Design an enzyme around this catalytic site. Structure first.
Site, PDB file in Angstrom:
ATOM      1  N   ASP A  31      51.298  57.162  -1.710  1.00  0.00           N
ATOM      2  CA  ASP A  31      52.044  57.173  -0.455  1.00  0.00           C
ATOM      3  C   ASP A  31      53.400  57.643  -0.648  1.00  0.00           C
ATOM      4  O   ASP A  31      53.524  58.137  -1.780  1.00  0.00           O
ATOM      5  CB  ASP A  31      51.982  55.888   0.216  1.00  0.00           C
ATOM      6  CG  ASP A  31      52.593  54.721  -0.652  1.00  0.00           C
ATOM      7  OD1 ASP A  31      53.025  54.815  -1.910  1.00  0.00           O
ATOM      8  OD2 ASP A  31      52.687  53.512  -0.095  1.00  0.00           O
ATOM      9  N   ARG A  45      51.550  44.540   7.493  1.00  0.00           N
ATOM     10  CA  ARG A  45      52.180  43.755   6.536  1.00  0.00           C
ATOM     11  C   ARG A  45      52.563  42.384   7.146  1.00  0.00           C
ATOM     12  O   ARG A  45      53.133  41.485   6.442  1.00  0.00           O
ATOM     13  CB  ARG A  45      53.400  44.402   5.953  1.00  0.00           C
ATOM     14  CG  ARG A  45      53.550  45.963   5.537  1.00  0.00           C
ATOM     15  CD  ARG A  45      52.651  46.438   4.677  1.00  0.00           C
ATOM     16  NE  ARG A  45      53.171  47.557   4.006  1.00  0.00           N
ATOM     17  CZ  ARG A  45      52.914  48.809   4.297  1.00  0.00           C
ATOM     18  NH1 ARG A  45      52.056  49.106   5.239  1.00  0.00           N
ATOM     19  NH2 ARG A  45      53.250  49.809   3.447  1.00  0.00           N
ATOM     20  N   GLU A  55      53.214  57.090   6.028  1.00  0.00           N
ATOM     21  CA  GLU A  55      52.950  56.514   4.746  1.00  0.00           C
ATOM     22  C   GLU A  55      54.125  56.040   4.041  1.00  0.00           C
ATOM     23  O   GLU A  55      54.183  56.604   2.932  1.00  0.00           O
ATOM     24  CB  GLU A  55      52.184  57.393   3.967  1.00  0.00           C
ATOM     25  CG  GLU A  55      50.850  57.725   4.652  1.00  0.00           C
ATOM     26  CD  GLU A  55      49.729  56.878   4.238  1.00  0.00           C
ATOM     27  OE1 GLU A  55      49.871  55.800   3.581  1.00  0.00           O
ATOM     28  OE2 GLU A  55      48.649  57.238   4.634  1.00  0.00           O
ATOM     29  N   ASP A  56      54.909  55.041   4.702  1.00  0.00           N
ATOM     30  CA  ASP A  56      55.983  54.451   4.104  1.00  0.00           C
ATOM     31  C   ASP A  56      57.152  55.507   3.664  1.00  0.00           C
ATOM     32  O   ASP A  56      57.708  55.619   2.528  1.00  0.00           O
ATOM     33  CB  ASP A  56      55.629  53.648   2.900  1.00  0.00           C
ATOM     34  CG  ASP A  56      54.624  52.578   3.178  1.00  0.00           C
ATOM     35  OD1 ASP A  56      54.723  52.026   4.332  1.00  0.00           O
ATOM     36  OD2 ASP A  56      53.630  52.278   2.309  1.00  0.00           O
ATOM     37  N   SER A  57      57.504  56.280   4.673  1.00  0.00           N
ATOM     38  CA  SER A  57      58.545  57.125   4.495  1.00  0.00           C
ATOM     39  C   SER A  57      59.351  57.052   5.698  1.00  0.00           C
ATOM     40  O   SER A  57      58.937  56.481   6.660  1.00  0.00           O
ATOM     41  CB  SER A  57      57.834  58.344   4.337  1.00  0.00           C
ATOM     42  OG  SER A  57      57.877  59.232   5.228  1.00  0.00           O
TER      43      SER A  57
END
Ligand SMILES: Nc1ncnc2c1ncn2[C@@H]1O[C@H](COP(=O)(O)OP(=O)(O)OP(=O)(O)O)[C@@H](O)[C@H]1O
Ligand SMILES: [Mn+2]
Ligand SMILES: [Mn+2]
Ligand SMILES: [Zn+2]
Ligand SMILES: [Zn+2]
Lengths: 83, 764, 64, 114, 133, 263, 36, 188, 146, 145
Positions: free
Chosen positions: B136, H51, I115-117
């Site tokens: 990721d 999360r 995606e976590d950016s």
């Protein structure tokens, strides 16, 4: 210890592996200014050219398949079916 | 050596198979390219620009093996290259290079990409290659490797390239799908009510790079020209592609807009979500791969993402603390749901306290009590959370993600909005670490919910101190277990791969070790490649005996049981024909056998089983390709069918040996595929259901045959590694009943252990 | 370390408002928000600017 | 670094032009022009005016990657009607309406105290 | 070049379930015990209420781009309020010894049970559908 | 004066709220964009440091320098340095400022931008001056010194556009709205129980007639009227951020015509 | 022994100074060498 | 050296989720509020529901009110603070109270169909960045190709690459060999 | 008649206490004492924050310019957090913070925060946001045992 | 437990059966107990399966143990992975688990014959390995026009 052209028993189609190695072998040679056999309807890239060759069936090479017991069969590029 | 490593980021504007390489990296890595009259003018220009301008070059090597260094080389500006000298050029757009995210636990962690040189410093990637690489964008870095000769470049592109790895052998489905945003949004875009106006339309349309220029005709003309979302996604799905699916009571009028129906490349009905466009057994990307080939499939991912993501960039989507709030009324129901469970507990309490509860059979009393109160409590948690789910609205963004499939699940609703639930450590409620109590804030002998780790609150609400600590207890146990999984899984995987590494398929179709020994006398018992295998239903298997005789029985000697003459031209003339009827009985006997056979092979009755050659889909296409009218008898004859399918069998070859032994092998290898086959092209079916014409039929067959041939495995393939990676890679995402399970178990199996942890006899 | 010159997000100059902000609270006894609004910082972006600065230079100036 | 200097966003490299015009193969009376060191400001603006014009069949634009300042506009028009002419006809409108507006502005501003 | 069904209908019902701009009419025919319509309508651009009623024609023109109104300023093969354009996916539910043909407008769906026009409803797409109030 | 119409509603040295009326969103937005991104302005963009025993670092100082807004009303009359045939800079492409400060006092000595001296010829084009908008006439606080500390510098300003770096941008926030009722159904409002109890009414609603519950949706309407408010930081006065902004687009557009003419 | 961590060893380390709280954290650490 | 943020660098809130910057946009191109406020950072919603990091969400409500109100917002654990409260406070101050706002797309100005949760949040810049991390070693005079990487390429079947890659530069010496005794005994 | 939005607490069924906690937030350490609302977070995440915090940049001491250490990061413009905990007081975090309050949007906008950016505001950067100072010190010794 | 079984009229139905499940295992002996069906008895101890019912039956158990594990996590891997493994573990006839100069000396004395088909050995020798694209030779086709 060789197996006669009739009586061959392995596939008549080309494998992915064979194909990849053929294209690559030939492109290597095309890359080293080796004569070509096909019309370059423009192409400058060796692989590409090779693939044009293989599609026009003008790659004069033969694939020797070993069987696991030492024995082998020779199939020509010309003949191998390409799918 | 000739490699680079940096941080990775995503990019919706690169194709599936590219990777973006910063310039600076591109100027560091080189490929040696031979001068020839095809490229001497390009190489010249690259030599001129040198080592520090990209497209350039770093060394020139001549005949002599002398190495000319472009940066120093007083003659760096005046090289006249010769045919057959070498230029080491920087890499440039479209060179093949291999990219890998570690740990490389299966082969799609090392695929081959086409470079694209870009500015700033990260390697970039399309979002849909993420998942194979398991990477990721919070830090991860990947490694990129430049091949150094022509042969190796060929190898990379003709076997490891990304497009060639959409469908993988591991699970005979795609391993790349539409994800995250574009999945949020392709659902949104495809809802009933989503309409788009002309202005946006045409911008969408121009966004798909190989739109023919035709503006499609809008599905509303009347008060206003308004096109639907479905129609404009459809632009991206290529012609010739059919797919259907029924969900829990879809119908061809899907009240709900469920399911999917798509015919010649246009969506008819259904919202598009992760079933369709995800990496799913028999969804669009698996359909298009096969029907049109890897490169068209890999463009599709980017046309789809271009379209959708544009749409999404102007529609917008977000989530907030609001999407976790459920109704007041819901909350009181939740709170009661909870309250009840706590009274069930209380009685089971008092009950045990008076010695009245019974255990059952080697289970202790306290074990019995726990097992119940934990049922109770969990049952509560779950009701409460279905409570919350229901209550949220379709515009609830959490819901919206769950719905499309792009992130989250029930448990998350639950715990965020209704109740987090019982915490446990080792399978059990929190235990009495001080004497006879879990914390000094409780009194001794307290077995109630609170004292032993039920957290009643949700996260929105907040945890109390005690709950807070027992949820930390919990948590920690996973942090540990996680590490220990990761560990265990790691060593298993290398051991499997060393063990299997040498097995390969040979051009007799046998699979063997480096000794020549035989492991399997044909790979996989069928000689297939697992990429080419799909879930299909074997029809003869199921069903009542009456029903199987309606569907397959033809009796030409009987007026109620022949083939109506509307089915078929010959149909008058065949009534009562005796000699057709002899064939047909032969055909049915074989159907009947078939069903017995198969019910011995699948004792359960499971009808859907992966086999090469998706015949439904061939037939579907035949039906579209020949514009077939379901209102005319066909021109097929009996014998055409009947002998036609017999003949095809003879040609689905896996083994080719003239002797009898190999022929028996051959036959046994293709038995199951042939059951499927006869079932699917039996005479009544082909007439009464499928209504094929002669020509179409003749087309269905020859296709079945080509496809079947093309699913045979190829000599040369290295299973073994494959098998091992395939078993290992998913044992790594075992990050997680009263039998030993999952990783330890699996250690227990491969290790062949004498003294297993839970051994058991199941006795019927 | 020192008031920043402008709101990171909108550009509003803000680095001519620190002495006053602090005079507005110690001199004129206003609550931090009433003080900010006085200085015309009315978007939450600029308010965040002065309201969460920390003038570290004032310590750094103690060293010799 | 690997960062392209920021001037690249508005200022043309050696050998680059403001426009390039190329004929679209897919359909008739169509062209695609790529505009360099330009972005949405213009690019949505020209486009949307091309679509007030009734002899406009199609108009669209897009910036293909955000990293570069360039856009591509595609015009399709009726037989007889050059596209580029449609873009003068359109850039012209623009100019004219703004003309107007800086005036209507400059005016509204003296009618003004503070 | 033609038209090919056309009649008047009685609206039983209107469900919007869950959508806000779209709703599903169940309509009957005034005439035939037999021929029905179930069908998806943009109620924003064309509202619709219980028992209202409807003059419904499928039809098949007045496949090349699309070009704006202009042709549309005299040339309207439409004297309607509401027109969609769809494609038939049929299932000829060939049910009882009455027909159903199916049709999808960008995913707004229709379905006609009946009979008399077997030898009438295109096998095929090019299918327009037109409504006045 | 037919076409896009204006209607200020409030104005002040520092902001100008108005309404554009009879235009397309595109031009409206575009004008917003230009105002934010491409109106030229003057700004320190080089700084040499002779001396700094300050408690901050140079680059930290310099960067603050480039943020202090400097006068810019005459900035079409300064050529972009890269267009000037001077070697590096001069008076035709550059105002030069200096700053010296020494902490003379026992107590702590501030450095403000008013402490900035211009040191080059301006040809009586009103540019370069530190803009000041505080009661005390200090302008911006650049640094602080302790007794014994010193900073000396020179700077060069140069014309530039916020595209290139936001220092050069004359506008600050730009309010922009449209359709405050929601009539166009351009947005779909999230809510728990009731969309209109839940979302606040815009000030801009008063200026516009609510819709009537019966009223069936209006398909044909478009976006015609926009509620703006441009706020200026100060290097250019406001009315000017507008006018120059309308002006700059109209320039862009014209360079396009000019280069069809050159094909 | 202070320079090395030579005792039990990891017993002395260089004090973290990334951030203030990282420092405080380091001075308040504990470690356990080597059934749950 | 001064380090200006760039594609690549890492950032986090304090709820145990980080991210690198994937691109920058200047302010014209961002989405904006009627007020003209624009984000300094834009994070993806798909990062949230699994999360279950509702404290993030609550910190951003709570932080809006703080700034609008000029009070510090009390986010300690185990108090009476509640979202309902907090949302009250923020409605008194004129915004929708769960923190959404309408915003307008940058490139076009049109409104966004969807509204958007928007608020301050405290974000940390973490150490360790794309520049320290990129290397790139290809000679003139991780980042490796180990057991497991070999194994994937045997998987794919790539023999020639596997020989290229794992050779020596160690030149191909040539040698005569008896074909009875395979040894290099042969006098040539 | 309790506040429906408060959490549920299960009373004193207790006449025998001998003590009382001073405050439950005191179970935590130095790191987790900087997380806001940890009682609204799944447990492991507060365990990751507790690490990451250890990598953030702020001002580690007011004396940096005078020391000389191997590495150091200082942020140009530390801000204190709009949302704080009561324990920070003691930890000084508001004095020597390690973070800035950023304006943040939670949104799909363009596909480059997947995606976590994250997309960050360049102009914001120009004007300072998250800029920091980085210092390395190299040492070296002289001759020795020759 | 539920058991799908076909019904009198041909379709599969459910038909519950009681089953017993043990801790601990004595297959040889329990199998023999009157009243059980010895033909369907099971154990997760695939060693005992092999000891009682033979190498085949243990191979089939072992497969079924591995497949359990892999589907217990909810994932799916094609038959064509797990069968290979399991064959590898049972082709000598029992269940074999899958988990320098010194060595050369022994070769020597053993007369070890290295088949040369691995990739390392080939490296050593400056060669491609006979795998994949290396499992055949290519030669020049002197027989063509
Ligand atoms: N797409 C996803 N689906 C399901 N869970 C996910 C997904 N992405 C992340 N999670 C998870 O988040 C948790 C860990 O969070 P984290 O963001 O640190 O993962 P990571 O990015 O792979 O970590 P790192 O890159 O530092 O190794 C895991 O338990 C899992
Ligand atoms: Mn990661
Ligand atoms: Mn992650
Ligand atoms: Zn601001
Ligand atoms: Zn000059």
């Amino acid at each position: 210890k060789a197996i006669p052209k009739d009586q061959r028993a392995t596939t008549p189609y080309m494998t992915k592996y064979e194909r990849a190695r053929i294209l690559g072998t030939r492109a290597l040679q095309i890359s080293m200014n080796a004569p070509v056999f096909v019309d370059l309807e423009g192409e400058t890239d060796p692989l590409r050219i090779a693939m044009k060759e293989l599609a026009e069936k003008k790659i004069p090479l033969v694939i020797r398949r070993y069987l696991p017991d030492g024995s082998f069969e020779d199939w020509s590029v010309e003949e191998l079916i390409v799918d | 050596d000739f490699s680079a490593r940096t941080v990775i980021s995503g990019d919706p504007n690169l194709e599936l198979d590219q990777v973006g390489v910063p310039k600076s990296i591109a100027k560091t890595l080189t490929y040696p390219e031979v001068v020839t009259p095809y490229n001497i003018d390009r190489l010249t220009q690259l030599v001129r620009n040198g080592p520090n301008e990209h497209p350039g070059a770093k060394y020139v090597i001549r005949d002599s093996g002398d190495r000319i260094d472009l940066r120093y080389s007083k003659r760096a500006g005046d090289i006249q290259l010769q045919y057959g000298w070498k230029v080491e050029r920087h890499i440039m757009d479209n060179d093949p290079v291999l990219f890998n995210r570690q740990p490389s636990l299966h082969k799609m962690s090392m695929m081959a990409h086409r470079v694209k040189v870009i500015p700033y410093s990260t390697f970039r990637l399309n979002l849909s290659v993420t998942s194979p690489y398991n990477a990721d964008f919070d830090g991860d870095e990947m490694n990129l490797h430049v091949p150094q000769s022509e042969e190796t470049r060929a190898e990379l592109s003709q076997l490891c390239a990304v497009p060639l790895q959409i469908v993988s052998p591991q699970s005979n489905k795609p391993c790349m799908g539409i994800v995250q945003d574009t999945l949020c949004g392709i659902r949104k875009l495809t809802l009933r009510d989503t309409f788009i106006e002309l202005d946006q339309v045409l911008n969408m349309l121009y966004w798909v790079p190989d739109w023919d220029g035709v503006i499609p005709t809008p599905a509303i003309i009347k008060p206003k020209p308004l096109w639907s979302g479905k129609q404009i996604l459809s632009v991206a799905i290529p012609n010739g592609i059919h797919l259907q699916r029924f969900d829990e009571g879809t119908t061809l009028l899907s009240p709900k807009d469920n399911g999917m129906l798509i015919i010649d490349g246009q969506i008819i009905f259904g919202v598009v979500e992760k079933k369709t466009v995800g990496s799913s057994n028999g969804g669009l990307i698996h359909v298009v791969t096969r029907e049109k080939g890897p490169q068209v499939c890999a463009k599709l991912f980017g046309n789809i993402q271009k379209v959708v993501n544009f749409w999404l960039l102007h529609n917008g989507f977000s989530t907030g603390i609001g999407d976790t709030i459920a109704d007041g009324p819901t909350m009181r129901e939740i709170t009661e749901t909870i309250a009840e469970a706590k009274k069930k507990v209380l009685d089971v309490t008092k009950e045990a306290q008076a010695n009245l509860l019974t255990a059952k059979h080697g289970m202790t009393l306290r074990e019995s009590f726990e097992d119940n109160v934990v049922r109770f409590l969990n049952e509560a948690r779950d009701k409460a959370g279905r409570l919350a789910e229901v209550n949220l609205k379709d515009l609830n963004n959490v819901k919206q993600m769950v719905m499309a499939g792009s992130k989250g699940s029930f448990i998350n609703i639950a715990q965020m909005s209704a109740c987090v639930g019982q915490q446990s450590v080792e399978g059990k409620r929190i235990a009495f670490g001080f004497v006879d109590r879990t914390l000094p804030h409780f009194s001794k002998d307290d077995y109630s919910p609170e004292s032993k780790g039920f957290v009643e609150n949700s996260y929105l609400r907040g945890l109390t101190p005690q709950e807070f600590f027992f949820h930390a207890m919990g948590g920690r146990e996973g942090l540990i277990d996680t590490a220990v999984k990761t560990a265990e899984t790691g060593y298993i995987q290398r051991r499997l791969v060393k063990a299997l590494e040498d097995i390969m398929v040979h051009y007799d179709n046998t699979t063997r070790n480096s000794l020549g020994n035989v492991i399997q006398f044909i790979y996989g018992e069928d000689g297939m490649d697992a990429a080419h295998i799909e879930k299909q239903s074997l029809d003869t298997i199921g069903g009542s005996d009456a029903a199987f005789e309606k569907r397959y029985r033809v009796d030409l000697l009987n007026t109620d049981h022949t083939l109506d003459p509307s089915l078929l031209e010959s149909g008058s003339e065949i009534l009562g024909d005796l000699k057709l009827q002899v064939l047909l009985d032969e055909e049915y006997k074989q159907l009947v056998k078939d069903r017995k056979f198969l019910r011995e092979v699948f004792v359960d009755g499971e009808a859907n089983w992966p086999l090469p050659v998706n015949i439904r889909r061939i037939i579907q296409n035949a039906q579209q390709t020949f514009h077939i009218d379901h209102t005319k008898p066909s021109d097929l004859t009996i014998k055409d069918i009947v002998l036609g399918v017999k003949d095809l069998q003879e040609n689905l070859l896996v083994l080719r040996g003239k002797n009898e032994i190999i022929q028996n092998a051959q036959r046994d290898a293709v038995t199951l595929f042939c059951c499927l086959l006869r079932s699917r092209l039996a005479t009544r079916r082909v007439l009464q259901e499928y209504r094929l014409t002669k020509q179409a039929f003749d087309w269905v067959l020859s296709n079945i045959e080509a496809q079947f041939l093309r699913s045979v495995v190829h000599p040369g393939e290295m299973v073994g590694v494959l098998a091992a990676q395939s078993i290992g890679e998913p044992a790594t995402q075992m990050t997680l009943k009263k039998v030993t399970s999952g990783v330890p178990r699996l250690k227990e199996i491969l290790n062949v252990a004498k003294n297993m942890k839970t051994p058991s006899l199941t006795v019927y | 370390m020192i008031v920043p010159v402008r709101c990171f997000s909108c550009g509003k100059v803000v680095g001519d408002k620190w002495e006053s902000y602090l005079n507005l609270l110690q001199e004129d006894e206003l609550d931090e928000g009433t003080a900010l609004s006085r200085l015309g910082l009315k978007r939450y972006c600029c308010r965040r600017m002065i309201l969460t600065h920390v003038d570290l230079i004032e310590k750094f100036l103690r060293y010799n | 670094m690997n960062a392209p200097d920021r001037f690249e966003l508005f200022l043309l490299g050696e050998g680059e032009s403001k426009l390039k015009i190329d004929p679209d193969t897919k359909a008739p009376n169509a062209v695609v022009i790529t505009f360099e060191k330009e972005d949405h400001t213009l690019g949505n603006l020209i486009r949307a005016e091309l679509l007030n014009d009734r002899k406009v069949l199609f108009a669209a634009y897009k910036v293909e990657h955000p990293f570069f300042a360039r856009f591509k506009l595609r015009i399709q028009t009726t037989e007889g009607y050059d596209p580029k002419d449609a873009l003068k006809n359109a850039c012209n409108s623009i100019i004219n309406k703004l003309g107007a507006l800086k005036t209507n502005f400059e005016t509204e501003w003296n009618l003004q105290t503070l | 070049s033609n038209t090919l069904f056309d009649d008047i209908f009685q609206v039983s019902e209107v469900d919007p379930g869950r959508y806000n701009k779209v709703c599903r009419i169940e309509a009957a025919s005034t005439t035939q015990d037999q021929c029905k319509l179930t069908l998806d309508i943009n109620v924003e651009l064309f509202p619709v209420a219980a028992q209202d009623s409807l003059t419904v024609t499928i039809a098949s023109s007045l496949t090349r781009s699309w070009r704006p109104p202009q042709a549309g300023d005299r040339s309207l093969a439409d004297d309607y309020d509401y027109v969609m354009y769809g494609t038939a996916y049929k299932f000829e539910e060939v049910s009882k010894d009455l027909i159903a043909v199916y049709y999808s407008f960008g995913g707004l769906l229709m379905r006609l049970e009946g009979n008399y026009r077997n030898l009438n409803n295109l096998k095929q797409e090019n299918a327009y559908l037109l409504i006045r109030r | 004066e037919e076409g896009p119409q204006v209607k200020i509603r409030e104005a002040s040295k520092d902001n100008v709220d108005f309404i554009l009326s009879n235009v397309d969103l595109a031009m409206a937005n575009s004008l917003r964009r230009v105002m934010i991104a491409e109106i030229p302005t003057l700004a320190i963009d080089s700084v040499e440091v002779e001396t700094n025993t300050t408690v901050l670092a140079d680059e930290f100082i310099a960067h603050r320098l480039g943020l202090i807004p400097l006068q810019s009303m005459d900035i079409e009359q300064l050529e972009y340095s890269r267009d000037c045939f001077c070697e590096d800079h001069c008076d035709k492409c550059s105002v030069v400022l200096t700053l010296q400060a020494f902490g003379e006092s026992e107590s702590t000595t501030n450095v403000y931008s008013k402490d900035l001296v211009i040191v080059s010829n301006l040809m009586g084009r009103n540019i370069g001056h530190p803009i000041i908008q505080d009661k005390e006439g200090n302008g911006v606080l650049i640094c602080k010194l302790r007794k014994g500390q010193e900073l000396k510098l020179t700077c060069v300003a140069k014309k530039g556009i916020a595209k290139e770096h936001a220092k050069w941008g004359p506008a600050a926030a730009i309010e922009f709205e449209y359709d405050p009722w929601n009539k166009l159904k351009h947005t779909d409002y999230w809510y728990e129980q009731d969309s209109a109890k839940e979302w606040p009414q815009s000030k801009n609603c008063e200026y516009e007639d609510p819709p009537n519950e019966g009223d069936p949706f209006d398909y044909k309407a478009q976006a015609d009227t926009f509620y703006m408010n441009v706020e200026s930081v100060g290097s250019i006065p406001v009315d000017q951020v507008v006018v120059r902004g309308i002006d700059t687009l109209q320039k862009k557009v014209a360079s396009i015509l000019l280069a069809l003419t050159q094909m | 022994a202070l320079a090395t961590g030579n005792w039990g060893a990891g017993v002395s380390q260089v004090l973290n100074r990334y951030t203030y709280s990282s420092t405080l954290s380091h001075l308040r650490r504990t470690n356990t060498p080597i059934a749950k | 050296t001064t380090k200006i943020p760039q594609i690549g660098d890492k950032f986090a809130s304090r709820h145990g989720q980080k991210g690198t910057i994937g691109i920058t946009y200047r302010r014209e191109d961002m989405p904006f509020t009627a007020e003209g406020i624009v984000p300094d950072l834009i994070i993806n919603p798909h990062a949230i529901p699994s999360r279950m990091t509702v404290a993030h969400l609550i910190e951003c409500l709570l932080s809006k009110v703080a700034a609008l109100s000029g009070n510090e917002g009390d986010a300690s654990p185990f108090t009476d603070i509640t979202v309902e409260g907090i949302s009250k406070l923020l409605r008194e101050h004129g915004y929708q109270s769960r923190g959404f706002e309408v915003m307008y797309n940058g490139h076009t100005g049109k409104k966004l169909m969807a509204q958007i949760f928007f608020g301050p949040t405290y974000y940390q810049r973490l150490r360790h960045m794309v520049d320290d991390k990129i290397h790139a070693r290809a000679r003139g005079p991780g980042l490796r190709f180990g057991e497991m990487e070999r194994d994937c390429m045997i998987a794919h079947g790539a023999a020639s690459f596997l020989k290229e890659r794992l050779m020596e530069a160690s030149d191909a010496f040539r040698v005569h060999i008896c074909g009875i005794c395979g040894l290099m005994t042969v006098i040539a | 008649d309790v506040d429906p939005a408060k959490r549920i607490r299960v009373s004193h069924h207790a006449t025998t206490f001998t003590h009382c906690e001073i405050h439950p937030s005191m179970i935590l350490g130095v790191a987790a004492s900087i997380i806001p609302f940890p009682d609204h977070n799944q447990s492991p995440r507060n365990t990751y924050q507790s690490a990451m915090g250890k990598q953030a940049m702020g001002v580690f001491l007011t004396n940096y310019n005078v020391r000389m250490d191997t590495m150091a990061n200082i942020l140009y413009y530390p801000q204190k957090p709009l949302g704080t905990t009561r324990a920070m007081e003691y930890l000084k975090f508001r004095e020597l913070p390690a973070g800035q309050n950023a304006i943040v949007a939670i949104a799909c906008y363009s596909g480059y925060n997947q995606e976590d950016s994250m997309i960050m505001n360049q102009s914001s950067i120009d004007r300072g946001l998250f800029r920091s100072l980085f210092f390395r010190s190299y040492m070296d010794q002289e001759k020795k045992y020759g | 437990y539920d058991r799908k079984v076909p019904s009198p009229t041909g379709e599969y139905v459910k038909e519950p059966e009681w089953v017993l499940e043990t801790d601990g295992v004595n297959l040889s002996e329990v199998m023999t107990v009157p009243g059980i069906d010895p033909t369907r008895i099971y154990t997760n101890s695939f060693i005992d399966i092999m000891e009682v019912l033979g190498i085949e039956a243990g191979r089939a158990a072992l497969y079924k143990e591995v497949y359990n594990v892999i589907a217990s996590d909810g994932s799916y891997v094609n038959y064509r992975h797990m069968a290979l493994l399991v064959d590898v573990m049972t082709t000598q006839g029992g269940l074999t688990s899958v988990t320098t100069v010194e060595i050369l000396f022994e070769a020597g004395a053993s007369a070890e014959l290295d088949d040369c088909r691995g990739v390392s050995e080939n490296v050593i020798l400056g060669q491609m390995a006979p795998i994949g694209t290396g499992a055949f030779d290519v030669m020049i086709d002197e027989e063509s026009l």
